[PDB]
């Protein structure tokens, strides 16, 4: 399996590097997605994480524009950061951005919960190449329409702690089905985190889990539940 941490630029550099010590310690991928908070201490986080270990990162560009963006390419490319674009801006900056990087350094993100503002997005990004990923999914009729809307480029974020037993082993099969897709399991509770490794190894399986780093010792016992 592999483990994300999903933190904020402004997370104690400190617990960042022990969670990433421990995930490499057990001989598991760790990658970090990164919100773009403060460019400054995204880019401490970033040489921090390369030189802890990390497998990739992701970084949240939030409200980095492209001129913002422009300013520290270099520093993205020379750490080979992957962009996750949070589409509160227009196709004009999407695009602009899609061009500054490259589409496969490049990915849409947003919540599902969008009306048709969801819809317009996926077809721009379909377009381009780009993948596209729908997070706070819990319904297998959100994952089972994104693959309709997106195709191969659909990522899903699965909000585990908020899905039905029903819902989890839908969208696992579909996941299945349709290996280029990623599946993104958010992960809390370690009970159901646990229940999904053993739903998962009957319908599926790489499974991805995605993981706050807000406190260690939590993180810990998480990681520990997915093995």
Same mark, same amino acid.
Not at 42 to 62: F, S
Not at 127 to 133: D, F, K, M, P, S
């Given at each position: ?45 970033? #040489? ?13 560009? @939030? ?14 490319? @020379? ?8 589409? #509160? ?17 490049? /990915? ?26 729908? /997070? ?6 959100? +994952? ?18 908020? /899905? ?52 260690? +010792?939590?993180? @810990? +016992? ?6």
């Amino acid at each position: 399996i592999e483990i994300v941490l999903a933190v904020s630029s402004s997370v104690d550099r400190k617990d960042v590097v022990d969670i990433i010590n421990y995930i490499n310690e057990k001989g598991i991928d760790v990658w970090l997605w990164l919100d773009a908070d403060k460019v400054e201490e995204a880019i401490e986080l970033i #040489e921090e994480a390369v030189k802890a270990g990390v497998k990739g990162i992701v970084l949240r560009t @939030k409200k980095l524009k492209l001129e913002d963006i422009k300013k520290i390419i270099d520093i993205l490319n @020379k750490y080979g950061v992957h962009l996750l674009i949070d589409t #509160e801006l227009e196709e004009e900056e999407i695009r602009a951005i899609v061009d500054l990087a490259g589409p496969e350094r490049t /990915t849409i993100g947003l919540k599902y919960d969008l009306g048709e503002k969801r819809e317009r997005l996926i077809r721009t990004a379909v377009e381009l190449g780009v993948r596209v990923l729908l /997070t706070d999914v819990t319904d297998r009729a959100q +994952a089972a329409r994104g693959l309709a809307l997106a195709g191969d480029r659909l990522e899903l974020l699965l909000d585990v702690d908020r /899905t039905a037993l029903a819902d989890l082993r839908a969208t696992l099969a579909l996941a299945a089905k349709n290996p280029k897709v990623g599946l993104y399991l958010r992960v809390s509770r370690v009970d159901l985190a646990a229940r999904v490794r053993a739903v998962a190894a009957e319908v599926a399986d790489r499974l991805a889990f995605v993981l706050d780093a807000k406190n260690a +010792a939590e993180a @810990k +016992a998480l990681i520990d539940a997915l093995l």
